[PDB]
Design a protein around this ligand. Structure first.
Ligand SMILES: CC(C)(O)[C@H]1CC[C@H](NC(=O)c2ccc3nc(-c4ccccc4)cn3c2)CC1
Ligand SMILES: CC(C)(O)[C@H]1CC[C@H](NC(=O)c2ccc3nc(-c4ccccc4)cn3c2)CC1
Ligand SMILES: N[C@@H](CCC(=O)N[C@@H](CS)C(=O)NCC(=O)O)C(=O)O
Ligand SMILES: N[C@@H](CCC(=O)N[C@@H](CS)C(=O)NCC(=O)O)C(=O)O
Ligand SMILES: [Cl-]
Ligand SMILES: [Mg+2]
Ligand SMILES: [Mg+2]
Ligand code: NA
Ligand code: NA
Ligand code: NA
Lengths: 200, 200
């Protein structure tokens, strides 16, 4: 039968949400294991590397959110439809992840953390939004003729950015339309209704 | 027909080197276009997301070094020998890239830059080296029974780290052995002999 899938991450959307969307879209059953921050050192001690999310697939522990997402979407409708499309999917996702990963999520000094979030959102985020809008143009989805997991990743990253900067897309209605289209995909809409509500 | 490839990056190994290794290994002819930092301000607006490397292929523009590397290795013996091993390849590459991407390559204040390079090399690089070494164990390659582009990426990243900290691997003979194996692969050895000599 199907594998036993167990996703481990914090009780946040964060870096695990892309995998959660993929499982929902593919209608694949999984255990959505959410740990408290206090229990990270114990979990970490059991892993080959030093980060979450990780995905157990039967007896195998996978790591790296995008490596996992790519694996789960291979040979599904969420992959790019062609080899080149798969390159473009990968590139857009890495561009989004690169930007999200610039935020000092783990900075313990709160004043330093807030200053850097504000700088990134005020002076850098608009340039990424403009690059993404130009890249999308008048097309329905970011890559090819149908939805890919890059579209999911756009909606996920932008949801978190909008928490901190609600007017991020005021000048980019086409990027708003794309978010709404992802959110209206039935399996995604259903997951959004039912998922734990967390800030991040 | 023979493909028309043009790689654009700075005159450094940097983030383009993985692509250069793959082109060498696959016997692919390409234009290795190297810009100087003084060319950057005028090239930036031509780039899809404001970053290099980019790769032009038969009139199309690709970006994101690892997206490009993955695209070039699909259907080659560098990709990973099973779908699950391709996931492992991808995860190792992202773990390496995540670490290299922590370094403040573009920091202006040189004292701030040096402090952070030293901190990362002292208190974070040892954990990565230990985790990689334990993952490799007694195996010949990082993933599977033959070389993959993750092994290439290990050698590339560690070569640069060793510029700053020559002693970094003195306690990890198995990781040194793996570097030397990559460096002796005929295509790689010959590329190393002929490539432009740059610090980074
Ligand atoms: C246990 C510990 C070491 O103290 C951890 C330190 C990191 C922290 N982590 C965050 O607080 C966080 C929250 C939200 C979030 N979202 C992204 C994101 C989203 C989409 C794409 C890429 C990245 C990264 N994030 C990190 C969680 C605790
Ligand atoms: C002109 C400008 C906008 O100011 C640029 C800002 C970035 C800087 N960039 C570096 O100076 C640099 C040097 C070496 C290097 N090596 C990696 C590396 C290597 C292996 C794997 C992943 C990353 C990244 N690097 C960046 C070059 C100038
Ligand atoms: N590129 C990795 C990044 C993973 C990552 O940074 N995870 C953070 C949680 S948001 C983590 O595990 N931090 C714990 C630590 O650094 O000890 C991925 O997407 O999986
Ligand atoms: N993850 C991207 C990162 C690309 C990147 O940041 N490249 C640097 C050159 S080392 C760049 O374009 N910097 C331009 C800038 O800092 O404004 C990739 O691997 O292609
Ligand atoms: Cl040769
Ligand atoms: Mg598809
Ligand atoms: Mg990355
Ligand atoms: Na990154
Ligand atoms: Na474009
Ligand atoms: Na909506």
């Amino acid at each position: 039968g199907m594998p036993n899938y167990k996703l481990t991450y914090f009780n946040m959307r964060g870096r695990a949400e892309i995998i959660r969307y993929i499982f929902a879209y593919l209608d694949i059953q999984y255990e959505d294991h959410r740990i408290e921050q206090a229990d990270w050192p114990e979990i970490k001690s059991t892993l080959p590397f030093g980060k979450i999310p990780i995905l157990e697939v039967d007896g195998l522990t996978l790591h790296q959110s995008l490596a996992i997402a790519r694996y789960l979407t291979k040979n599904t409708d969420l992959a790019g439809n062609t080899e080149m499309e798969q390159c473009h999917v990968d590139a857009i996702v890495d561009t989004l992840d690169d930007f999200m990963s610039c935020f000092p999520w783990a900075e313990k000094k709160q004043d330093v953390k807030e200053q850097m979030f504000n700088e990134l959102l005020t002076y850098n985020a608009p340039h990424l939004m403009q690059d993404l809008d130009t890249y999308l143009g008048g097309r329905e989805w970011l890559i090819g003729n149908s939805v890919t997991w890059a579209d999911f990743y756009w909606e996920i990253c932008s949801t978190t950015l909008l928490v901190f900067k609600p007017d991020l897309l005021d000048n980019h209605p086409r990027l708003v339309t794309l978010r709404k289209k992802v959110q209206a995909i039935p399996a995604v809409a259903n997951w959004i209704k039912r998922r734990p509500q967390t800030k991040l």
